[model samples]
Target: TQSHAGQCGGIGYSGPTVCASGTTCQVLNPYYSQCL
Candidate 1:
């Protein structure tokens, strides 16, 4: 029961690295990989 793709509501969190346009994310601990 999980098949979400390009679903934009408030335009938040939808894979593809969160599909950013105006880039404003800083993943402090993305799966313990520490993304920046």
Candidate 2:
């Protein structure tokens, strides 16, 4: 799982889509998304 400011998703990025409790996932770009 991802936490705040942690990697959650992105282009070609394979990882947990669920973020830490109280956090949400947000894509910052096409290649780098994170949890917030």
Candidate 3:
């Protein structure tokens, strides 16, 4: 499967927010990803 990253001080992994439906809240290490 593919992955997505969250920008620094942005949202999700950055802002500590949760992902929407069909998406998974996770940390991509050096980055973050909220896949739907």
Highest-scoring model, TM-score: 2
The residue pairs found clashing in candidate 1 are none
Ranking by lDDT: 2, 3, 1
Using Cα atoms with residue i matched to residue i, what is each candidate's TM-score against the true structure?
Answer: 0.18, 0.49, 0.26
- Evaluation by TM-score, superior candidate among 1 and 2: 2
C-alpha lDDT of residue 27 in model 3: 43
Q: Cα deviation of 15 in candidate 2 (Å)? A: 2.4
Best by lDDT: 2
Candidate 2 on 1-36: residue-level lDDT in tens? 445457777768765567675445677887887776
Give the C-alpha miss distance for residue 23 in model 1, angstroms: 5.9
- Report the Cα lDDT for candidate 3: 0.40
Model 1, span 1-36: residue lDDT tens: 222233322224434443333333344444321122
Flag regions of model 2 displaced more than 4 Å: 1-5
Total backbone collisions for each predicted model: 0, 0, 0
Candidate 2 vs 3: which has more lDDT: 2
Q: Residue 29 error for model 1, in Å?
A: 0.1
Error of 3 at 15 (Å): 0.5
